[PDB]
Amino acid sequence: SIEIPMDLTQPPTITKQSVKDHIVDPRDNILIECEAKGNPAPSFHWTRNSRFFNIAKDPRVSMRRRSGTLVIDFRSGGRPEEYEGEYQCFARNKFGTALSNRIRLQVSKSPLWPKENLDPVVVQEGAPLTLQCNPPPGLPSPVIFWMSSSMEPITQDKRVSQGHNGDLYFSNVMLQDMQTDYSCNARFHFTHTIQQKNPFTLKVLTNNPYNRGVAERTPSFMYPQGTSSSQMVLRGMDLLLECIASGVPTPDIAWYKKGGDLPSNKAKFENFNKALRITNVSEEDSGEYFCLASNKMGSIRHTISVRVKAAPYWLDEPKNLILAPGEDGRLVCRANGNPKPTVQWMVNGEPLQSAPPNPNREVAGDTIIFRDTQISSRAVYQCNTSNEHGYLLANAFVSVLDVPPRMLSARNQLIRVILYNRTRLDCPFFGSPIPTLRWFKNGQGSNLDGGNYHVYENGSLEIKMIRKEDQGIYTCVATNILGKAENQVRLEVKDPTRIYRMPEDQVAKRGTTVQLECRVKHDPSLKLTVSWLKDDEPLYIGNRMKKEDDSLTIFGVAERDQGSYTCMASTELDQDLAKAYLTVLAD
Ligand SMILES: *[C@@H]1O[C@H](CO)[C@@H](O[C@@H]2O[C@H](CO)[C@@H](O[C@@H]3O[C@H](CO[C@H]4O[C@H](CO[C@H]5O[C@H](CO)[C@@H](O)[C@H](O)[C@@H]5O)[C@@H](O)[C@H](O[C@H]5O[C@H](CO)[C@@H](O)[C@H](O)[C@@H]5O)[C@@H]4O)[C@@H](O)[C@H](O[C@H]4O[C@H](CO)[C@@H](O)[C@H](O)[C@@H]4O)[C@@H]3O)[C@H](O)[C@H]2NC(C)=O)[C@H](O)[C@H]1NC(C)=O
Ligand SMILES: *[C@@H]1O[C@H](CO)[C@@H](O[C@@H]2O[C@H](CO)[C@@H](O[C@@H]3O[C@H](CO[C@H]4O[C@H](CO)[C@@H](O)[C@H](O)[C@@H]4O)[C@@H](O)[C@H](O[C@H]4O[C@H](CO)[C@@H](O)[C@H](O)[C@@H]4O)[C@@H]3O)[C@H](O)[C@H]2NC(C)=O)[C@H](O)[C@H]1NC(C)=O
Numbered sequence: 001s002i003e004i005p006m007d008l009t010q011p012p013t014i015t016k017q018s019v020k021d022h023i024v025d026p027r028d029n030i031l032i033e034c035e036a037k038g039n040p041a042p043s044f045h046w047t048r049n050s051r052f053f054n055i056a057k058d059p060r061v062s063m064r065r066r067s068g069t070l071v072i073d074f075r076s077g078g079r080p081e082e083y084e085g086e087y088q089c090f091a092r093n094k095f096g097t098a099l100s101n102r103i104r105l106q107v108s109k110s111p112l113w114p115k116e117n118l119d120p121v122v123v124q125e126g127a128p129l130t131l132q133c134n135p136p137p138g139l140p141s142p143v144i145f146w147m148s149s150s151m152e153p154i155t156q157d158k159r160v161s162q163g164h165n166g167d168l169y170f171s172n173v174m175l176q177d178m179q180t181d182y183s184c185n186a187r188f189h190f191t192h193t194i195q196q197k198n199p200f201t202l203k204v205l206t207n208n209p210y211n212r213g214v215a216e217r218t219p220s221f222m223y224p225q226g227t228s229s230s231q232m233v234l235r236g237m238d239l240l241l242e243c244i245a246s247g248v249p250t251p252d253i254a255w256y257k258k259g260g261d262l263p264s265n266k267a268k269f270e271n272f273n274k275a276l277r278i279t280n281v282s283e284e285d286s287g288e289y290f291c292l293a294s295n296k297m298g299s300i301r302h303t304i305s306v307r308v309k310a311a312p313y314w315l316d317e318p319k320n321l322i323l324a325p326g327e328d329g330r331l332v333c334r335a336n337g338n339p340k341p342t343v344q345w346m347v348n349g350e351p352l353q354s355a356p357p358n359p360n361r362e363v364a365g366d367t368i369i370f371r372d373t374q375i376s377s378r379a380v381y382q383c384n385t386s387n388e389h390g391y392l393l394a395n396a397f398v399s400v401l402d403v404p405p406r407m408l409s410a411r412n413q414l415i416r417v418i419l420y421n422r423t424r425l426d427c428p429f430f431g432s433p434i435p436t437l438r439w440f441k442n443g444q445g446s447n448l449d450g451g452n453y454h455v456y457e458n459g460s461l462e463i464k465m466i467r468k469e470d471q472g473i474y475t476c477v478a479t480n481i482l483g484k485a486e487n488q489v490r491l492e493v494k495d496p497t498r499i500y501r502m503p504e505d506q507v508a509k510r511g512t513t514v515q516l517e518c519r520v521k522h523d524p525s526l527k528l529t530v531s532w533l534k535d536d537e538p539l540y541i542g543n544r545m546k547k548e549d550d551s552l553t554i555f556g557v558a559e560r561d562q563g564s565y566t567c568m569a570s571t572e573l574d575q576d577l578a579k580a581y582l583t584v585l586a587d
């Protein structure tokens with residue numbers, strides 16, 4: 001899209017808005033950002049659960065100047081809990097009306113643990129255990145972890161560990177486990193609060209007599225019951241898998257995939273090889289993953305169907321259509337999702353069914369067509385692509401104006417660059433009908449287009465690799481049926497800064513004055529900076545250290561001076577580094 005300054009007539013456009021699922025803190029004076037841009041003063045208003053919400057009536061709520069950002073003050077009192085639900089921001093002006101996402105405003109809850117009577121659980125030496133947390137309802141899912149009442153972080157290793165769900169898992173209980181209590185703890189991000197479940201205790205029943213006394217045993221599956229399970233993760237998300245075993249000799253978990261090698265760049269082991277995590281996920285990663293609980297006595301596999309589904313994501317987001325009277329335009333709302341996301345069309349937040357009828361407007365599948373567009377039907381169109389999992393919302397408006405091409409950058413720019421480096425000329429422009437911009441060099445009639453000259457949407461001209469021929473005066477002209485505008489830029493190819501004589505690596509004894517030569521070629525008409533780095537951090541010039549134009553001298557070396565010195569020669573357009581190692585002997 002293209003931006004418009006304030007002075008020029010402009011429909012509304014939302015700069016910044018809060019999250020769809022906006023979660024908040026009960027303490028703070030609560031603030032909701034809704035900011036819009038519009039040459040004619042936009043007016044802002046709000047709606048909760050599909051019913052208007054009156055700001056003036058509520059004394060606590062007040063509005064920022066020249067924006068729709070709302071602030072609520074709790075000094076008097078009151079409670080955020082009563083404000084939960086779906087809210088919507090509306091920014092209106094003469095030209096049109098712009099909407100925002102439906103904000104599922106909820107306040108983070110940090111409920112205390114229900115005081116429950118806990119009998120300590122018992123077990124014979126070396127049987128498996130599943131220690132259950134089951135927190136009270138938590139939005140968001142709290143940070144779960146296990147602590148002693150003595151406040152010490154609790155023994156976690158290959159043998160025994162915690163799940164993502166929050167329960168603790170013992171492949172095999174040992175004698176030592178009785179030493180301490182185990183208490184579940186949950187953090188809530190927003191309030192910075194931790195909840196502690198009543199601590200557990202265990203009892204062990206070794207009967208072994210004096211006379212590896214305890215019996216050995218097969219592995220078994222504990223968390224993923226049965227052979228098979230299904231998990232769904234959305235595209236682009238972090239994928240996480242877990243496998244829990246139970247064998248007297250501590251089982252070892254290995255992870256693999258159906259007829260294919262694991263992408264090592266993205267996958268990694270967490271939680272002592274009992275968790276596997278991947279980075280951004282694609283349909284590549286979709287398929288069948290399984291896990292082995294290898295053990296000396298037996299070994300077993302669990303399979304998981306990893307169907308990579310997706311909340312809708314934009315393939316082609318509809319961008320603003322600028323048309324001259326009688327030009328043809330189409331709006332494309334294409335979101336990819338698994339299952340396929342359902343497309344929903346509204347006109348200024350009104351159902352298309354009952355919208356004012358228009359002959360130019362034709363709707364088909366997911367696309368809207370205006371043939372021979374006129375002043376009529378100038379409004380903001382909305383697309384809600386939604387599925388079981390999630391939804392995406394997109395706005396697009398059409399503005400009709402009649403103005404000649406305008407120049408948006410400084411006149412007579414001066415641009416500098418070295419020989420074989422990529423460069424860019426920024427000549428931004430704009431016009432009511434799409435004006436053709438053309439480049440001219442050294443007063444040549446022929447417009448510059450083709451090899452080694454490329455033009456983008458905004459008008460910046462890129463030189464992929466520069467020759468000495470390219471240097472000179474460039475004129476960019478934006479023109480259309482209505483009128484024209486012109487602008488000048490001078491392009492200068494200068495000489496790169498390269499270090500032809502590097503400092504010499506050397507071995508010196510204590511109390512000798514040493515010199516390092518760093519000769520660099522730079523263009524005479526350029527700002528050169530030459531500094532040094534000791535080891536791997538910047539060096540400070542001082543007493544006993546003399547800096548010559550092309551060399552550096554140190555008096556009175558010792559063992560501390562030993563190391564790597566780095567000559568840095570930089571100009572506005574270029575940078576080069578040279579390194580030398582100095583070693584020191586003893587007396
Ligand atoms: C873009 O479109 C998408 C959808 O395509 C839309 O997302 C929907 O958003 C609304 C509003 O937030 C969600 O509706 C909520 O529904 C709550 C009850 O959940 C049940 O009903 C859901 C559908 O709501 C309709 O039916 C209910 C009665 O069922 C009715 O109250 C509503 O008014 C509405 O007519 C349904 O999706 C949901 O299904 C989930 O859970 C079931 C198990 O229960 C499970 O089987 C499903 O697989 C799924 O997981 C469930 O059946 C409702 O409580 C809530 O508010 C209502 O109650 C309050 C309090 O009484 C009232 O004040 C209020 O008026 C409502 O009556 C709300 O209505 C809906 O669930 C979303 N749909 C999907 C698919 O996610 C986006 O918002 C759209 N985007 C934009 C920008 O508009
Ligand atoms: C103007 O634009 C040009 C072109 O874009 C820039 O040239 C780049 O300069 C950097 C150095 O800043 C080059 O990085 C070089 O990497 C070499 C190894 O390259 C291979 O392997 C890398 C991955 O490691 C691949 O990406 C690449 O394709 C190659 O296959 C090193 O050997 C280089 O170091 C040595 O030579 C340089 C020469 O300048 C010396 O100064 C060093 O001291 C050292 O002796 C170097 O690190 C990069 O490859 C260049 N090309 C590109 C496309 O980036 C200019 O930096 C830029 N500015 C100017 C010219 O002033």
Ligand SMILES: *[C@@H]1O[C@H](CO)[C@@H](O[C@@H]2O[C@H](CO)[C@@H](O[C@@H]3O[C@H](CO[C@H]4O[C@H](CO)[C@@H](O)[C@H](O[C@H]5O[C@H](CO)[C@@H](O)[C@H](O)[C@@H]5O)[C@@H]4O)[C@@H](O)[C@H](O)[C@@H]3O)[C@H](O)[C@H]2NC(C)=O)[C@H](O)[C@H]1NC(C)=O
Binds near residue numbers: 236280281282
């Ligand atoms: C997960 O996120 C990443 C990061 O956003 C996504 O990576 C983008 O992938 C697309 C599609 O391939 C890329 O478009 C390509 O760009 C290539 C240029 O890449 C060079 O420069 C990169 C830095 O800009 C550099 O990282 C890369 O080196 C790495 O990959 C090389 C691939 O050959 C490999 O040889 C190297 O060893 C190193 O691992 C290259 O030097 C270009 O060559 C292609 O033709 C194509 O245009 C984007 O550039 C990637 N993003 C970025 C920031 O570079 C990835 O797709 C995401 N995956 C999923 C599943 O969502």
Ligand SMILES: *[C@@H]1O[C@H](CO)[C@@H](O[C@@H]2O[C@H](CO)[C@@H](O[C@@H]3O[C@H](CO[C@H]4O[C@H](CO)[C@@H](O)[C@H](O)[C@@H]4O)[C@@H](O)[C@H](O)[C@@H]3O)[C@H](O)[C@H]2NC(C)=O)[C@H](O)[C@H]1NC(C)=O
Binds near residue numbers: 426428457458
């Ligand atoms: C008109 O549209 C043109 C579309 O191509 C614009 O040309 C592009 O201009 C940009 C901005 O100067 C150039 O971006 C370059 O990016 C490199 C690398 O980025 C560095 O910084 C990022 C920060 O995230 C970092 O991730 C990278 O690793 C790099 O460290 C910079 O080194 C360059 O200086 C420059 O910023 C593009 O190169 C250029 N297009 C192409 C294809 O090269 C043009 O700017 C637009 N005109 C206007 C007025 O907006």
